Amino acid sequence: SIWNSVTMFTEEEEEEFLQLSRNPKLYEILTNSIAPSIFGNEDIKKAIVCLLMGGSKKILPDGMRLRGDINVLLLGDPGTAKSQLLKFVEKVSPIAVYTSGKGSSAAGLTASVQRDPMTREFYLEGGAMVLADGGVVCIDEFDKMRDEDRVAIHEAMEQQTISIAKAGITTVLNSRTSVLAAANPIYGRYDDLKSPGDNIDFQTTILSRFDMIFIVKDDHNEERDISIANHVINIHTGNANAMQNQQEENGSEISIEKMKRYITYCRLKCAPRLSPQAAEKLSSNFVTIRKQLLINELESTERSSIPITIRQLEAIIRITESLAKLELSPIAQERHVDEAIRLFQASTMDAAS
Amino acid sequence: VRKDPITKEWTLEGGALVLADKGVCLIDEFDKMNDQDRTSIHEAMEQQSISISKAGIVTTLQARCSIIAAANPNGGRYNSTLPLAQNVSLTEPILSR
Amino acid sequence: TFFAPDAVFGDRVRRFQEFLDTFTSYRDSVRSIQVYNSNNAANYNDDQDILPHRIIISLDDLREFDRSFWSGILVEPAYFIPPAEKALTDLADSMDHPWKLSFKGSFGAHALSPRTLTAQHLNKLVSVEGIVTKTSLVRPKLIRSVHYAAKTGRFHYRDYTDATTTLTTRIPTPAIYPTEDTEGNKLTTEYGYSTFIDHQRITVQEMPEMAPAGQLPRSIDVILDDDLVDKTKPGDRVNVVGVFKSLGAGGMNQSNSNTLIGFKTLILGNTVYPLHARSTGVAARQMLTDFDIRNINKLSKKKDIFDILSQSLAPSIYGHDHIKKAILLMLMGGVEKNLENGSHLRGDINILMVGDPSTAKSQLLRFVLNTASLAIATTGRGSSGVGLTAAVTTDRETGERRLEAGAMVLADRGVVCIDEFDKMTDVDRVAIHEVMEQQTVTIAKAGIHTTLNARCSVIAAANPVFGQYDVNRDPHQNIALPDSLLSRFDLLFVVTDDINEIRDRSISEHVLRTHRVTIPFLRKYVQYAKERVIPQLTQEAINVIVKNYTDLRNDDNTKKSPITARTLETLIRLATAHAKVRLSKTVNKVDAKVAANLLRFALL
Amino acid sequence: PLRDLDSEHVSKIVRLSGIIISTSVLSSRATYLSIMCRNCRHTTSITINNFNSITGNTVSLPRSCLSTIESESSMANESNIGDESTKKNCGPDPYIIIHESSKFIDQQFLKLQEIPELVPVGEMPRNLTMTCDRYLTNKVIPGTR
Numbered sequence A: 001s002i003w004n005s006v007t008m009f010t011e012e013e014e015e016e017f018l019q020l021s022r023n024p025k026l027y028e029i030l031t032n033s034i035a036p037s038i039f040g041n042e043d044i045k046k047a048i049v050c051l052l053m054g055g056s057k058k059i060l061p062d063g064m065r066l067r068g069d070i071n072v073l074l075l076g077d078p079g080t081a082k083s084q085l086l087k088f089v090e091k092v093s094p095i096a097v098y099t100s101g102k103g104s105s106a107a108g109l110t111a112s113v114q115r116d117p118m119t120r121e122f123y124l125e126g127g128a129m130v131l132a133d134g135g136v137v138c139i140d141e142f143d144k145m146r147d148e149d150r151v152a153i154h155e156a157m158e159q160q161t162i163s164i165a166k167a168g169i170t171t172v173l174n175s176r177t178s179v180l181a182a183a184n185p186i187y188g189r190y191d192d193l194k195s196p197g198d199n200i201d202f203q204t205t206i207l208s209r210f211d212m213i214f215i216v217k218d219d220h221n222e223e224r225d226i227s228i229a230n231h232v233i234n235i236h237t238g239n240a241n242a243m244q245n246q247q248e249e250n251g252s253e254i255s256i257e258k259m260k261r262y263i264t265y266c267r268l269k270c271a272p273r274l275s276p277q278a279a280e281k282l283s284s285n286f287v288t289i290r291k292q293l294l295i296n297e298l299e300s301t302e303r304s305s306i307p308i309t310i311r312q313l314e315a316i317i318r319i320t321e322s323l324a325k326l327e328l329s330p331i332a333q334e335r336h337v338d339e340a341i342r343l344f345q346a347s348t349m350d351a352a353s
Numbered sequence B: 001v002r003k004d005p006i007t008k009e010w011t012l013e014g015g016a017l018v019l020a021d022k023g024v025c026l027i028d029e030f031d032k033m034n035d036q037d038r039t040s041i042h043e044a045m046e047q048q049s050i051s052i053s054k055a056g057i058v059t060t061l062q063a064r065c066s067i068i069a070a071a072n073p074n075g076g077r078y079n080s081t082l083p084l085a086q087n088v089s090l091t092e093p094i095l096s097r
Numbered sequence C: 001t002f003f004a005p006d007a008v009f010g011d012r013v014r015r016f017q018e019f020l021d022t023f024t025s026y027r028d029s030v031r032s033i034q035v036y037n038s039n040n041a042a043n044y045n046d047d048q049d050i051l052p053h054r055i056i057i058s059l060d061d062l063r064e065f066d067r068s069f070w071s072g073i074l075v076e077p078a079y080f081i082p083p084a085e086k087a088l089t090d091l092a093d094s095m096d097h098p099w100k101l102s103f104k105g106s107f108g109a110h111a112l113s114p115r116t117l118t119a120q121h122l123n124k125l126v127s128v129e130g131i132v133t134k135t136s137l138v139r140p141k142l143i144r145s146v147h148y149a150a151k152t153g154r155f156h157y158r159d160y161t162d163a164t165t166t167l168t169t170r171i172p173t174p175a176i177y178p179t180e181d182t183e184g185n186k187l188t189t190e191y192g193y194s195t196f197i198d199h200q201r202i203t204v205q206e207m208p209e210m211a212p213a214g215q216l217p218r219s220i221d222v223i224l225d226d227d228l229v230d231k232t233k234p235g236d237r238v239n240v241v242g243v244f245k246s247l248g249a250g251g252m253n254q255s256n257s258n259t260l261i262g263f264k265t266l267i268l269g270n271t272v273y274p275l276h277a278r279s280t281g282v283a284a285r286q287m288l289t290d291f292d293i294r295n296i297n298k299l300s301k302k303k304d305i306f307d308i309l310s311q312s313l314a315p316s317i318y319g320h321d322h323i324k325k326a327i328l329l330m331l332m333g334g335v336e337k338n339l340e341n342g343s344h345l346r347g348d349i350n351i352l353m354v355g356d357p358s359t360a361k362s363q364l365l366r367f368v369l370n371t372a373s374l375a376i377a378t379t380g381r382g383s384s385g386v387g388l389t390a391a392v393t394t395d396r397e398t399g400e401r402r403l404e405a406g407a408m409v410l411a412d413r414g415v416v417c418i419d420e421f422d423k424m425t426d427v428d429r430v431a432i433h434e435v436m437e438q439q440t441v442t443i444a445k446a447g448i449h450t451t452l453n454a455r456c457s458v459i460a461a462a463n464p465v466f467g468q469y470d471v472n473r474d475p476h477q478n479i480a481l482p483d484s485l486l487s488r489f490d491l492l493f494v495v496t497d498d499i500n501e502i503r504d505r506s507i508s509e510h511v512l513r514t515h516r517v518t519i520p521f522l523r524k525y526v527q528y529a530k531e532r533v534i535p536q537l538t539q540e541a542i543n544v545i546v547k548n549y550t551d552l553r554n555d556d557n558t559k560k561s562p563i564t565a566r567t568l569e570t571l572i573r574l575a576t577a578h579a580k581v582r583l584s585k586t587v588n589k590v591d592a593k594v595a596a597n598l599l600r601f602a603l604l
Numbered sequence D: 001p002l003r004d005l006d007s008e009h010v011s012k013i014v015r016l017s018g019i020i021i022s023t024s025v026l027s028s029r030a031t032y033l034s035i036m037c038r039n040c041r042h043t044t045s046i047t048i049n050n051f052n053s054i055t056g057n058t059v060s061l062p063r064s065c066l067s068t069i070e071s072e073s074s075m076a077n078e079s080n081i082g083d084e085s086t087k088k089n090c091g092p093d094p095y096i097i098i099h100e101s102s103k104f105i106d107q108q109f110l111k112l113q114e115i116p117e118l119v120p121v122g123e124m125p126r127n128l129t130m131t132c133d134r135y136l137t138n139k140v141i142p143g144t145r
């Protein structure tokens, strides 16, 4: 039904939406429904939750405006089943486009303009970003891409507006997308035997333009391997884990078709905001982290591979409105930010070593 | 989307991966192909769905094929002791599937 | 008597007469038009020995005057427009010709784009907006003939009509272009006395910013009239208000018909307005009341306004005052001096930023893209046809080659905001060499050798060569686009990423409180600063830039590189612009001090 | 299925299933149009109801000035004394549509194609032509099943 889908709805759905949102364990019951098949990797399992909500949108005078939502890489070894996770985000999200390219398949990835042979007339051809306006775009093989449609991708993650300057038309259009890339290293764990950069061919400013870099490892463990193997045999047949999923649905883990409508309703109704003591908390954390990069920077006699910028502070300040926009409340609280200190702090432990 | 020289109306002409659903396709000599084809073979093994967007049409056709390939080594029959990803001139993501 | 018209026509004429005499601004507007043409006629008939005829009527007043006349116009306009035009010609003839109207609105939920136009909205009054393509040529139409006779010596006379006349219908009578009256005599025609009235048709597509995701566009076409020829170049964004007429006999005349569905449609008239866009078309129509120029005169005479308007472009960006000073000096732009029987000398300023990532270098250029007028942004590519036209024309009426302007021709008197300046290949950099000093674009492709005009101003923001190494090794190729491209640019701001603790604080509370002097006055300051008045340079400022320039050669040729005479010319340009800021007429030593300090911080 | 459509199915209710390639431009037919003789100065009106008989047409304008079929005396008198000894004639086809008191409707012309899964293996896929009435216009984006 997209584009021009249905917004307003009935009365009892408001009732049951106000009945789901009052549970104290909303974060757990959302972080157990995303991977009923993927074992392990609970951090990414947490990070998809704060990505499907979207941040705040501020149109403060002047003509400038800020953005939402955050952007996530998932670089790591094969066997992470990150591609199946991207198929899951394709199934959940209200609008979502899955392009594994290089452009795929007979459809390009950016906003190309093709003149109609009849009438000799310009029109917007399509692509990936323009069809998916107001949601999530998932990409495979972000390192192995053509590099002529790359400048537009490194523009549409920052100011949300793709520009066209061809021979006839000079319009500037909107794209409120939220990129979720997933690249692949060469030789695997030798990346973390090297410096944590040294994967993308050209430069590492790309790794500073993103927000939450995740790095997946693999360590052989016997009970872990028997657990994943016996788990996958339980996944196969005769879908006993799906029967168990039905007895989960009798108790918790609401639905897919309830989850989609819940994401739409929680997205376009509320608009959250913080409290200034949380702001002095976040200043009191970020200044100490930057000083720690100053002392680690001065002692280790070289420059760092993954820098820290104020975009990292802007990502930290958007995570709290993601989680408040889950909790449906207009204001923010202290533990309500400290959980994001734990999570982004786990991504800094992903970042440094 | 291309025209048809017998009948002048435009036709949505599906590919062979569109055409061979619930069957077996036959592709040979990988080393003489374009990137435009290689993105389509990578597409059909990725999520079993070819989507097209030119010109005035926006669909997702379904394709659940089964490919039997027929490769060809580089120069000599078996170049060195080196393994297959080193021996053939292909790439790793088409060898993963 | 034409047809001795009914008392219904008398009712409409009398009622609209009462409305037009109720509110009395329109009488004063008619008086203004009539007096202006009168005194112009006195100048053209007295020394040596133009304005059209339409009144803009707003639909605010008729809703509080008559519901019947209001909802009468917006349903059946072929019964209500010719009476009101008749009464207005009655008033204009009685106070001292067509005298058409406008109907500026405020329209009645007929605000519809040409995607949703047809067909139960037909033969009503409809407002349509969109892009204009593919505007045809202007041709003159004949109305009245005049013939001289031989040998009896009497002129003659004949009329002509069409289907695109006044909005009713009429039983058509064709009429042969006459020759050989009774009795048989040759009728040699004439020109100069026979009238002619112009005619032009344009077509309208729906907006691409409003269009669906990807689908084919659907379009209609508009006929224009006498006083509406040549308003809108192709590429504009245009509001049209008109009448959705449907003329023609649709194949029901002759049997066994082809052209399966007839009844071709169009729009007559009436009031083409061009409107502002985000990236094409001027916005210099902004109003200036006497209150506003009185306030500009009130703030005009202070001594801190350059330091007030410095900190005005940054509501939410910390630091970087000297960049803001450079951007205001770009928006004022200096003055343009064309010589006599030579070549002109360039007026504006060109600015390149370069520095580390995450330094708000891309956030700034959107703000310059909003506050200015005629901003056009080109990122990356590029080829083909940014600086050229590419000449792809396949004109259907005859074999001929036209031009279709790119981004450089179209941004005249404007600002071009280029991002990622290193990613450009050198083949387009040839065209940037052609633009940024020669100020002309010569195209001799297939073709037609031409020399059009384009005098834009350029802002770019390039990355370093490798890493953020802006100070580490040397300034000698941390940028590496040598070397004439470094000399064409006036200023080279070099932005670093120093780490501190106080800087972390001052950034911190700024970014934190941002999540929770005013610009629509500032652009009204800008345009009045631009049209009035140009300054002249005076004796008090020569010796400062002479001593300063010999200083910069004899010592900055011992420190850095390069220095040409173009630095001297840009000193003169920044002096003139800072003279324009304070709304003065002459040039003081203060200007040379300020521009001197800006070039010191820019180079050193 | 679209492959087997004999001539035995001419003018019956037959449903099917395919893929819509591309639509067309919104047209305008007429439903109520009021006419006038350009010689006789007569007035009539015509309503038409069912409007898809594409190269028929559904109706035409009448081809005589139609006043000579009159059940009155003095109307036949003035229509007799249009001339002096011979009868008058508007004819040939004299009528003129007045465009300022009519009403119009819509018509679409889609185009339909069989699904490319079965069984075009040797062949080329074959196609038909649709037609829509009033409220069935502008409902289907080209691409759907």
Ligand SMILES: Nc1ncnc2c1ncn2[C@@H]1O[C@H](COP(=O)(O)OP(=O)(O)O)[C@@H](O)[C@H]1O
Pocket: A037, A038, A039, A040, A077, A078, A079, A080, A081, A082, A083, A084, A228, A232, B096
């Ligand atoms: N923890 C897991 N739970 C379930 N399936 C898994 C798990 N780990 C890996 N898989 C399997 O791995 C495959 C996905 O491969 P993947 O690593 O996504 O390829 P790539 O990331 O190189 O595109 C899937 O078929 C999936 O069944």
Ligand SMILES: Nc1ncnc2c1ncn2[C@@H]1O[C@H](COP(=O)(O)OP(=O)(O)O)[C@@H](O)[C@H]1O
Pocket: A158, A310, A311, A314, C316, C317, C318, C319, C356, C357, C358, C359, C360, C361, C362, C363, C364, C511
């Ligand atoms: N001095 C500053 N004050 C406030 N915000 C800043 C500052 N410097 C950088 N930023 C942040 O940097 C972002 C813009 O990055 P930018 O440097 O423009 O992109 P790029 O380097 O890729 O061209 C903005 O979101 C803005 O919030």
